[PDB]
Write a protein that binds this ligand. Structure first.
Ligand code: GTP
Ligand code: GDP
Ligand code: GDP
Ligand code: MG
Lengths: 16, 371, 439, 49, 426, 427
């Protein structure tokens, strides 16, 4: 998906 | 583990209904109270011995620190699953051939564990008998069946218990008295059935049919149903108190009265209000100091009203009941009802007409004005 | 009304913070997502979670804690863990590069880029707070993050909030046990600050907890999951009077003024009882008179020290569960009749007692036996002066040949600052000597 | 094996009691403080008639 | 027309003070709801002393509840009988006192007492004929000893010609539930001896030994200790609201008892106490109560009466009994214990008899003693003070708020003045 | 009742208008077919303001969609709500303006206004009681600035006793998406100041900064920005369509915020904005709305309010709430920020209350603010206008269409008088 790697605002991408 | 109930209390000043959360801990028997409106604690965790787990069902009144709280709701899904899921409500009929042993039948039901919430001894007319036996309108034995159900008074009772329908039908057993005696003699029909036609009992089989029977007998609209068997002549009034009803000695009182020999003219169950109790005890105001104690004991729960006939088997009913204090009754007249079934002067489990003048007025207040 | 703010700094503070906050949810019946179960409902007047959790209008509970770490590899475990829906997504502050066991990176070079954001959160949590009572800072003496970043953070709080109590919880470097090699350095650089800014600083170490886990619990090979559960139960026993009702309750200020006699003697010890396994408690009965004697034995001390060398100065017994005050009163007078427990003559009364009503709760999957009563002992002793003695001896052999200094002076730290920090613990050593003498 | 070389984070279980079924970790350990008679019935008892 | 104002401060005084209200409402037949629910007319003839009739025939107490932390205020309001108080009588702060005497008297207590006596000024003005005050506190802390001492000096300036009476729990030698306890005890006796007309000392150790030997209780929790103190509170003032054979109110218990203005610390007691096992084996008559009255085990302070002398002893008997056997028998105590009572005062004994026994017990007799043996309870606090003061321990919390070191020297000097006078008359 | 005739010119106005008629279709529960699928009867009682009744229970917007180029008309009619606009309301020219003011105002925008004025006059007379006009365009384009401001002049001379509100897209320095637009920005504000009662300046750095720090979207396309513009456009007239405790129509906002006829340049904001992760954590409370309201980060123009001093501020609140916490909060912020309001007018804050918050939300509040820091917007365009006019850059596209060079001299002469009088009442 999106935001797999832990950099550059990954938490919001994992949320949405 | 705790059980939560929402309770109403009527404030004597503001004339306001107030909602509280009542939390009971059955592991240790302590209560706690919270306020819904103000979101603050009303009473901390306090060991209250008077409140018990058997007194917790919806619609009940419990006296918690001189406040009468009526439980109206279930607090949460946990207590709604643990208590209200199993409970079922059903109807019991005592036929005219079992009127003499109606006390023993009520005693058997009390040992079975049913809670009686409505009770009425009454006579059924022809149209009400037709509505009762509309399922048997194909007429296998309809003429003699209607004649048997109409020739004498019956007793209709509302009884609540877990698995109530199955337990009551298992208690009654087979319809034929000889078949019931052959199979299992411990059944009510087996013990007190002279024949299959005179089964001396009746029990509904399905939920919709049972609800139809309640709509016929005890009308939810509030209108008057079938008439009571009130004779209004040569009669006295006697009340089985709420503490005696909750303890379960009602069958013993009926058996003791029957063995004494006085005839029960009428019998019903009432849930009284404070003003009705005050106007029933209006003669006791200014005479005794514990008038409020007697009033509060009377409206603390439902009471069983009785009209008792002819009062002359051996002695009058007042001296059969005996002295007002149960300790005095036990010490002086050991055969009296207050000696047998009494605990406190306030809670002595029977009330009798002290004045011979006032008996007809009490019977008129209970069996005419109220119903 | 009663409130506390918890800040977890460094790897040691955050990892215990994972263990203390999982226990706090079980006490108040809060699921890991941050909501209460739908089967059971709470009463209207509940302030039990108001100490640690803040009510959101959507029926969600949010902890009152800040998790600051200069490296991301530990906070990202929390954000990707099973408690990802519990904490605030913005209270979890992270940096880019760690302190690398350097005090100069955590205080002078890298620690000055984030502290404007760190104090912004503490301002927000305190402004939403109605009545604030103290702080609970979790760190360790050894790390560059636990020593460097704690120093400039906590001095800014004393500037901002004047007379608010501040309670650390620090991992003491053990005598024979040490992981880093800059360990004698970073302890000296912390204690130059915590004397004039802290009111009660509690100490625990890894080595004494290892031997407690070896004998009592029969855990032959303890690990970090085992230690942080034991430390988390003491903090939940200290704060138990602000959350629940008790026979006689102790506020944060009440044991703050009863435990420190002098402004430079504010380093109490933590002791918990009974730490026992499941099988041993099945045979041995737990009385009130026995668990209170278990605290005063030297084998149950959670700091590797000998309490028999020094003398006791002030003690605080904090009970929980089904404890009546009559049994405690005869238990204390039993202890004062013993001659091996030596109290100072200038402090005739030294015990203060707090009794609560709720028993401890065991975390499932744990090791601790489920019991009824438990007691946490907070004692101020003079025996910890020997602990500071051997740490200064470790410092003096490093600085004799000027080893490991060129990493510190390369980031902005002066060479001379080691001299003022060393003479401070020279003064702290004889301050314990000056109060321990009799008349 | 578990008695001599146990895994990490697990208590050393004796081989004699290893196959013994366990009821100890479930129940409550310790002695219960006994309830006493209340001071109400000792100082201001229930009035007699 | 005889009015008593109650005030509750501290945690130890609030729990005993709350427990005082279940006892008298049981005697006067008041429900927890607030209605009169009893059996006798004779209860309602004097209800103006403690309660206030409100609209609708409900009774509210005349008491003011003050404490700096709202935890104990919520603990009393959420009690069994807690719903009858005035909701505007609950005066609480938002910061804990911290068991510091300078926090309850100088900074955090100085902003509250403007709103504290303002409620008291309302309840005092609406009375017809005020008689006195009753304040419950403890000497061993900073809350009860901080505002309790302060509320004594502020009220006594407004109302000088009254009798302001406090019931105070004193520090104990063996228990020691506070570390700075002799510091906070000495700072209050400096102003207790100056502006209080009657003080009753209650001990925590003596109430333990009564529960352990006389009552033979197994676990004497704090719900029982407050019920012993609550009996003596309702026994000393029973001649203001019940008809008796020989009546004696607090000012008559003022003139008889104190010869000199600085000796007014009394040792109380209750006397029909028995254990559960030996109820049937004890004879209940006036000569048996007298031995229990003068028993040293039945005293509520850790002072041995046999190691001192008695100035003045009073007894408030209760119930239907004779007067000759009351008077002849408690004179027999004076003749046999002749050396123990003083020689320069004849008739050390005052006897009072009321005709209403308490709930369920046919007789009662509360002991009140004014002896010289109370100097040893005051000596032990003075000696504990010296051992900490010579090292100046725990004194940056007091000096850091505005309290001076010269205040502490004056308090110990006045404490040593008080122990000197008891030995002087001995 | 009080019908709002929405105008929609240019390419920027069409994309704002396509997003504006999507939000209030969600508010009134209007499906893309045109019927009504709602639950509560509060939506249908006041629906004549924005929608017009037809046969079969079909509601159509009272919107006029105008552009000189048919390219964006195909994108409007092929959107999500493209089948709800009336086919007779698409007035389109054949040739584009080409980012020139004179082509859109004198030559190519002169024949199309005759067809538009037939449509507008037909719709205006169909209203029972007309309330005003509302227009959205762009100052940096050819059709929106050149020809949209021509319709403002022609409407104002036919219906004088009405109200005119514009949602104009002022240009930005770093979002310079046209090299000639200081010519079009200068000549547009010369027409705007005399024929407009309310002006809401909307910028793009203001919206692009918000989606990075507040909504933290990684790809903020124009559909994200047009929602924030359309959220303000529905929050300003929310008391005109819904009941409340204290209503305020469009004329009530113009009375309070306009003390002088040449001070009608507002600068807006919207109160409840938070990221996707912060939805479940933040508690929406009246101080939480007001704290975000007055901050310069959420404000929707490229001007810092701290470099100027406020004249008059209005706040339109929505949602069930309590008036004490409302009335206390904008009195309290007036007390600390006593230096940020001029002292010659007391009690500068207008309060408006509705009862119906938007869907999925419980409390909402729209910030409208008059400020003298909007002079910083007009000083940047004026210094750019003079820089080319010294060297006569790009002038032959203008003087070759009919306009003289003196029109450029009077456009800056009136615009320099505006920045002269904003500065005077600040001091
Ligand atoms: N009890 C306990 N001690 C820990 C834990 N984590 C680290 N420590 C102790 O911390 C010491 C090293 O300091 P750290 O806390 O790891 O370093 P730091 O504070 O994170 O500083 P940086 O690594 O530079 O970010 C070790 O000697 C450990 O004893 C833990 O989870 N539990
Ligand atoms: N009888 C009784 N004594 C108490 C209670 N709580 C505390 N105490 C006594 O009060 C002493 C401490 O005083 P404290 O309550 O801290 O004083 P405060 O801070 O002014 O309230 C202890 O030694 C206890 O013995 C109680 O509920 N009942
Ligand atoms: N915020 C926003 N700006 C837009 C949108 N569409 C166009 N613009 C702006 O409008 C400017 C171009 O306008 P233009 O199409 O030339 O206007 P026209 O020639 O009159 O049609 C560009 O600088 C864009 O930034 C939109 O949907 N949202
Ligand atoms: Mg680390």
């Amino acid at each position: 998906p999106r935001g797999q790697c832990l950099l550059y605002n990954w938490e919001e991408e994992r949320a949405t | 583990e705790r059980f939560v109930f929402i309770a109403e209390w009527y404030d004597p000043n503001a004339s306001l209904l107030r909602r509280y959360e009542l939390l009971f801990y059955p592991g240790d028997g302590s209560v706690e109270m919270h306020d819904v409106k103000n979101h603050r604690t009303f009473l901390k965790r306090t060991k209250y011995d008077n409140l018990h787990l058997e007194d917790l069902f919806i619609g009940n009144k419990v006296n918690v620190f001189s406040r009468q709280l009526v439980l109206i709701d279930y607090g949460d899904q946990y207590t709604a699953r643990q208590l209200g899921s199993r409970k079922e409500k059903t109807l019991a009929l005592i036929k005219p051939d079992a009127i003499s042993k109606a006390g023993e039948i009520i005693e058997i039901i009390n040992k079975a564990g049913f809670t009686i919430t409505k009770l009425k001894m009454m006579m059924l007319s022809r149209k009400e008998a037709l509505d009762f036996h509309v399922d048997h309108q194909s007429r296998p034995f309809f003429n003699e069946l209607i004649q048997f159900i109409t020739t004498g008074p019956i007793i209709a009772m509302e009884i609540l218990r877990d698995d109530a329908i199955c337990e009551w039908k298992r208690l009654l057993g087979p319809a034929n008295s000889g078949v019931a005696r052959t199979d299992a003699s411990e059944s009510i029909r087996a013990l007190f059935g002279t024949d299959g036609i005179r089964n001396a009992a009746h029990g509904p089989d399905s939920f919709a049919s049972a609800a139809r029977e309640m709509e016929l007998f005890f009308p939810s609209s509030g209108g008057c149903g079938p008439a009571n068997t009130a004779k209004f002549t040569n009669c006295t009034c006697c009340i089985v108190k709420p503490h005696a009803v909750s303890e379960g000695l009602l069958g013993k009182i009926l058996m003791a009265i029957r063995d004494a020999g006085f005839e029960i003219s009428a019998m019903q169950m009432f849930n009284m209000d404070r003003v009705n109790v005050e106007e029933f005890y209006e003669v006791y105001k200014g005479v005794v100091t514990e008038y409020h104690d007697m009033v509060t004991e009377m409206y603390s729960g439902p009471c069983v009203a009785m009209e008792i006939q002819q009062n002359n088997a051996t002695k009058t009913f007042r001296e059969f009941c005996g002295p007002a204090d149960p300790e005095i009754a036990r010490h002086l007249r050991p055969g009296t009802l207050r000696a047998i079934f009494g605990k406190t002067k306030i809670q002595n489990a029977v009330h009798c007409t002290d004045l011979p003048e006032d008996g007809l007025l009490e019977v008129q207040y209970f069996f005419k004005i109220l119903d | 009304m009663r409130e506390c703010i918890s800040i977890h700094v460094g790897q040691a503070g955050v990892q215990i913070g994972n263990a203390c906050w999982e226990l706090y949810c079980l006490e108040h019946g809060i699921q890991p997502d941050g909501q209460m179960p739908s089967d059971k409902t709470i009463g209207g007047g509940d302030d039990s979670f108001n100490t640690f959790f803040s009510e959101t209008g959507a029926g969600k509970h949010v902890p009152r804690a800040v998790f600051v770490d200069l490296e991301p590899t530990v906070i990202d475990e929390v954000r990707t863990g099973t408690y990802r829906q519990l904490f605030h997504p913005e209270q979890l502050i992270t940096g880019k590069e760690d302190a690398a066991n350097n005090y100069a990176r955590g205080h002078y070079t890298i620690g000055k880029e984030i502290i404007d954001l760190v104090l912004d959160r503490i301002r927000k949590l305190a402004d939403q707070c109605t009545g604030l009572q103290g702080f609970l800072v979790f760190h360790s003496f050894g790390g560059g993050t636990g020593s460097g970043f704690t120093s400039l953070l906590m001095e800014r709080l004393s500037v901002d909030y004047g007379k608010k109590s501040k309670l650390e919880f620090s991992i003491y470097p053990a005598p024979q046990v040490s992981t880093a090699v800059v360990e004698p350095y970073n302890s000296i650089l912390t204690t130059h600050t915590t004397l004039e800014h802290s009111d009660c600083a509690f100490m625990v170490d890894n080595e004494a907890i290892y031997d407690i886990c070896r004998r009592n619990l029969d855990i032959e090979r303890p690990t970090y999951t085992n230690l942080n559960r034991l430390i988390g139960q003491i903090v939940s026993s200290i704060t138990a009077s602000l959350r629940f009702d008790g026979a006689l309750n102790v506020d944060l200020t009440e044991f703050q003024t009863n435990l420190v006699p002098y402004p430079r003697i504010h380093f109490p010890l933590a002791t918990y009882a009974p730490v026992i396994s499941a099988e041993k408690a099945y045979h041995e009965q737990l009385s009130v008179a026995e668990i209170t004697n278990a605290c005063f034995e030297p084998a149950n001390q959670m700091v590797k020290c000998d309490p028999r060398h020094g003398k006791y100065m002030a003690c605080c017994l904090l009970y929980r569960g089904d404890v009546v005050p009559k049994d405690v009163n005869a238990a204390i007078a039993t202890i004062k009749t013993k001659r091996t427990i030596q109290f100072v003559d200038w402090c005739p009364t030294g015990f203060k007692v707090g009794i609560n009503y709720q028993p401890p709760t065991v975390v499932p999957g744990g090791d601790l036996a489920k019991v009824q009563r438990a007691v946490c002992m907070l004692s101020n002793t003079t025996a910890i002066a020997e602990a500071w003695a051997r740490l200064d001896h470790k410092f003096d052999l490093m600085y004799a040949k000027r080893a490991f200094v060129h990493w510190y002076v390369g980031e902005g730290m002066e060479e001379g600052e080691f001299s003022e920090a060393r003479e401070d613990m020279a003064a702290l050593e004889k301050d314990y000597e000056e109060v321990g003498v009799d008349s | 094996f578990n008695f001599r070389y146990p895994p990490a984070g697990v208590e050393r279980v004796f081989y004699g009691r290893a196959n013994d079924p366990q009821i100890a970790p479930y129940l409550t350990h310790g002695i219960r403080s006994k309830i006493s008679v209340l001071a109400n019935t000792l100082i201001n008892p229930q009035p007699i008639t | 027309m005889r009015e008593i104002v109650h005030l509750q401060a501290g945690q130890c005084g609030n729990q005993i003070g709350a427990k005082f209200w279940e006892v008298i409402s049981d005697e006067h037949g008041i429900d927890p709801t607030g209605t009169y629910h009893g059996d006798s007319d004779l209860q309602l003839e004097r209800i103006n002393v403690y309660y206030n009739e409100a609209t609708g025939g409900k009774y509210v107490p005349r008491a003011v509840l003050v404490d700096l932390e709202p935890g104990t205020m919520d603990s009393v309001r959420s009690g069994p009988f807690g719903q009858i108080f005035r909701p505007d009588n609950f005066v609480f702060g938002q910061s804990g006192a911290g068991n510091n005497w300078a926090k309850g008297h100088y900074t955090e207590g100085a902003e509250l007492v403007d709103s504290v006596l303002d409620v008291v000024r309302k309840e005092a003005e609406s009375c017809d004929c005020l008689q006195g005050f009753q304040l419950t506190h403890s000497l061993g802390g900073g809350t009860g000893s901080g505002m309790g001492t302060l509320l004594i000096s502020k009220i006594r300036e407004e109302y000088p010609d009254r009798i302001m009476n406090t019931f105070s729990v004193v520090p104990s030698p063996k228990v020691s539930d506070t570390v700075v306890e002799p510091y906070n005890a000495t700072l209050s006796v400096h102003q207790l001896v100056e502006n209080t007309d009657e003080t009753y000392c209650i001990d925590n150790e003596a109430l333990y030994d009564i529960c352990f030997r006389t009552l033979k209780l197994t676990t004497p929790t704090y719900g029982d200790l407050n019920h012993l103190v609550s009996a003596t509170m309702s026994g000393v003032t029973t001649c203001l609201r019940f008809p008796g054979q020989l009546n004696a109110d607090l000012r008559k218990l003022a003139v008889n008892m104190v010869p000199f203005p600085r000796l007014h610390f009394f040792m109380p007691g209750f006397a029909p106490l028995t254990s559960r096992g030996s109820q049937q084996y004890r004879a209940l008559t006036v000569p048996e109560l007298t031995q229990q009255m003068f028993d040293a085990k039945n005293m509520m302070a850790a002072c041995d009466p046999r190691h001192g002398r008695y100035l003045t002893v009073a007894a408030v008997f209760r119930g239907r009994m004779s007067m000759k056997e009351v008077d002849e028998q408690m004179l027999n105590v004076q003749n046999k214990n002749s050396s123990y009572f003083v020689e320069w005062i004849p008739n050390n004994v005052k006897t009072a008899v009321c005709d209403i026994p308490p709930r369920g017990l046919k007789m009662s007799a509360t002991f009140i003693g004014n002896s010289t043996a109370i100097q040893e309870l005051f000596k032990r606090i003075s000696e504990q003070f010296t051992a900490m003061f010579r090292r100046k321990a725990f004194l940056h919390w007091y000096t850091g708020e505005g309290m001076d070191e010269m205040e502490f020297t004056e308090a110990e000097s006045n404490m040593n003045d008080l122990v000197s006078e008891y030995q002087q008359y001995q």
